[PDB]
Amino acid sequence: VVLQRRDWENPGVTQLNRLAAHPPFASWRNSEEARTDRPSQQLRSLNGEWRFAWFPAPEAVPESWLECDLPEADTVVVPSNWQMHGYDAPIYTNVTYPITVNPPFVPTENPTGCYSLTFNVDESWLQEGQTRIIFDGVNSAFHLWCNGRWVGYGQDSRLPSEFDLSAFLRAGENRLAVMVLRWSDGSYLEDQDMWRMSGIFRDVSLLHKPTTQISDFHVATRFNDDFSRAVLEAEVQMCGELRDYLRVTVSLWQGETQVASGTAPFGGEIIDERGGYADRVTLRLNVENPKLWSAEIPNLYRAVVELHTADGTLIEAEACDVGFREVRIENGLLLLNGKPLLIRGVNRHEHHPLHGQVMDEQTMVQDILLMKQNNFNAVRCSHYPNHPLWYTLCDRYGLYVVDEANIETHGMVPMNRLTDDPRWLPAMSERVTRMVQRDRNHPSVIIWSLGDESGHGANHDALYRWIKSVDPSRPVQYEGGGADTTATDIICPMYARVDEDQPFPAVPKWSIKKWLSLPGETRPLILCEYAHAMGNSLGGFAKYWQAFRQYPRLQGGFVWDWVDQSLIKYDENGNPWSAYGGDFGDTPNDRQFCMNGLVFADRTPHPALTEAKHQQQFFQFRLSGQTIEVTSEYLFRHSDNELLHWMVALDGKPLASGEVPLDVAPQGKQLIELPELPQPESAGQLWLTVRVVQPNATAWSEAGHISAWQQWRLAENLSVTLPAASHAIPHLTTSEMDFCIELGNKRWQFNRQSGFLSQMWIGDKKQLLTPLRDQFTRAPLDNDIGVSEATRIDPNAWVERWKAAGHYQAEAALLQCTADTLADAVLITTAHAWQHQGKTLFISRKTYRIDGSGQMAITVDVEVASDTPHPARIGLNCQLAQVAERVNWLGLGPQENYPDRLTAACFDRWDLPLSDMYTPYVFPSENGLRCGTRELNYGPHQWRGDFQFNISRYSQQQLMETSHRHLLHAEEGTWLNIDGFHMGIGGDDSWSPSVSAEFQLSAGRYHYQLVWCQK
Amino acid sequence: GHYQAEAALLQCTADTLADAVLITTAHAWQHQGKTLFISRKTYRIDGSGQMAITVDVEVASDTPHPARIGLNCQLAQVAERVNWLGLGPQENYPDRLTAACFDRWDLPLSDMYTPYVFPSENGLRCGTRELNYGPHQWRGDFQFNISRYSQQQLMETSHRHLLHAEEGTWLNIDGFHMGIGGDDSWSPSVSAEFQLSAGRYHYQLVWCQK
């Protein structure tokens, strides 16, 4: 029957014998246990060691497996994805389905995971009541047997499937058999951009419920106009025999204090001409001055639902955390507790580099702590309902949640092919309805989403209305079909730009500022995805935040995304390395597109994380004379754990500092008068840095946590006094091939054939391994590459424009190399042209002035042909012979920063180990740049000027030729790139050019100057 | 003190190269002990009679952004025509130059002055790579105005009919010029991107006779 019906190739069959969905149950038989959320004796975990065998197709599964352990099976940990155990390959594909698009059929070769468990059941569980099994997540479809007998079937990889095992179990030892199919008709609705894995990847548990039981309960909280009064309404449903002596009590607790209680027999109010629900009752509790829930202050109450008899005998209790909050859209603004939210959000996939798609509490906690520490207040469940514990943690730690249905059909042509088809309405409805039934009591969930990237079909409209009808307490959003359809309360585009329209036919992405004011449009706009953080990215992040702050109806967005989806593989030395698409023999694949995170897979931050934290600050600052104005962007909390630290420094040298307690009301202002600052000793620029410091530890942060900062230039005293003229004078030695300059122990060598400084000597020690030459290219970032590949070039991508113009292979042709002796210096003058097939791309004109103090002043003037694509950089590079431990600089830092991603960086004196000046992006590229640098120190060398630089053991050549960071090898010496100018990195998306015009090197003529000396 | 700041000489040196003379200068402009601007220059005069002037200016970050960064002089020459390769033919400023076209323009000198009834800075042309006036040619990438009225006279005279032609011709050649604004005329209206706030500025001119 099972192999004959092929339920996994029929979208009409999404389950067999599956129980109704409901909120989290534990069936406590003690009310105090329910109140305190202590473990329940009636809820057992079946996680641990199971038996597992892999088969290529369900037809290959032997019948004996139903009754007897297979001797060829292995003992494996559950929950798990079987790809993470090495049984077959995980597949990384973005849009294109991993299977032939032929709905509702899947491949005949359909990897089949045969799980089994021998376990014990207490006799008391079978003597009364109902024993069910709960599978929180099975990917993608499964049949279940118990003691050899068939129980049921389930689809939807991201919601729990529950089955009554009461009739199947015996006292003592029992054996479960679970046949998990990798592919099913459900796979057509699970085309999310992520690793395609399978298995029993979430918790398995057993729940005992009494025969007479709470089968569902819904908790609603409504408020008066100023939120000083609330009514809690709890609808409770039962199954079992109705008796007049049955009662429901709902009690509400604030900590140890019961604040309200109500008791009633079953029997709901009249609904229609046939009466009401005899199996339901609704309790209403008054609450004066409720403590309100927000991400700022996650006040929670506990609601306990007791099923009992009139004489007082408890039958069972269920419970949940209650957060008193109202979510509503009014006058085009999303309001929480009457105040307009500013969503500092991120999209978060459930990903672990070792365990795949199996989530654990420790990883979830680490994510939430890192999010809150970096000024995020919201998370989108991209693109499926999460592990149940996620919502509990968001309730308790305080994050706003977008809960999203497990529906994505991105690879269909057109995208709405299934979602507009009524044949698929049943399968889609269950993914929406069962999510709402599970998650509706969680205060952290503020918005429902209909799924992701499935076009706009009539099924979306039906399901949109279904939610609006069942749950009026939360807006519904959905991006498909152009982000502003009739199926969304919120304009929720993905990667719409701040100022630039992208008028794609049918589904345009308007500038977000322009989108708001389109004729007739009144809704709020919150980007469901923006700032694609792929590799070296988040260029232009500050532009979004400026606009979010300026425009009331631009209420923020969710960054794409939290964590890189890299996976651990092991090399010959057994060393773990980070793997992406294709590294498992998976083909077709989408290579490094699985890595878009603000953090590495192990939760180490990318440099971009600090840019997000700074732009998402909850305190804004202005300076006027001696006065600092601090504005709070909190809606509910006073600044009761904040002090402002201020510091004034002269080019990195501290001059004065101080502390002032912050006492600011939500949305209020505080004026801080800085004391009269002493006059600086010498020339230079004074800089003011302020930081907001949290003195006290919280649930989400340590004592001394920095939550906000800002810098200003104060007074500058320009240096007018000439240094004392040195007595030494450099000597020019002219030969046919070289111009040499000597000054005591030091010597400079300019090759007359090449026109470059080819060597320098301090004593008899050589300083260079490669000559000092102009550089106009970079190892291409992911944003430079986009979707371009060797097999399918995207001629519009930055990397391809540079390649085709000859930027990477242009040869320096010497035009001029002269030497002159000045009164106190030797002057070398050079001119080079870079050409590709008869075309002059760049001209570089330089002077090198070496004086008696041993300083070499370099002046560079570059011409760039207006009709060549704007170059990635205008600078100099060389390979130094020196390898030194430390890098010391006066400039923006301490972390990596680029021209369109440097707002988080501060100007100061920074000192780091050399390894910190390299950013280990899994896909290697130009990295580690620091901008606005006036002084750089490395070993015996000092460079002064106004430049950007990176410094590492890897050439640009090696970085661009190496696909994986673990394959990089430190070269001899140290590669130095010093740029007068550097192009933006972009990142509004990573599939089209995204570097804004103002960060492109289009001026045509460029000037910079450096001084190279010994410090 | 921008209007009253006096140039203090910091350096003036002359060197002889293989085929050129190199004059190096540095100046500081101060007001009550505060250094507003520093100007460092080289003048390189070669065998072909061309003088290459390289200018590097520092502007104190806490001084209000300057109206221009350039050179001026009063020429002895009064010529009938002004010929230039740059934006024109009409007066244009960095935040009002979209209507102007890059081409070869040739106008009578009087057309290079705009007779605003209340006199002010006027007649600038931007994006100019070559200017010709009598025997003189200047080349580079600059903005310029040219007339018989000094900036000093224009600012001291409240009506255009009270202006008098001065001896010779006043040339203002700017590497950089501030926007004119106009969103209104009762509060500062020059947009941030047209203010001279970069702190360090570089431009080059070649002066020669043709």
Ligand SMILES: CC(C)S[C@@H]1O[C@H](CO)[C@H](O)[C@H](O)[C@H]1O
């Ligand atoms: C590459 C685009 C055509 S689709 C684009 O791909 C991204 C890659 O990380 C994300 O998955 C986005 O959600 C998706 O819109």
Ligand SMILES: [Mg+2]
């Ligand atoms: Mg099916």
Ligand SMILES: [Mg+2]
């Ligand atoms: Mg997708």
Ligand code: NA
């Ligand atoms: Na806003």
Ligand code: NA
């Ligand atoms: Na991706």
Ligand code: NA
């Ligand atoms: Na405080």
Ligand code: NA
């Ligand atoms: Na690379």
Ligand code: NA
């Ligand atoms: Na005047």
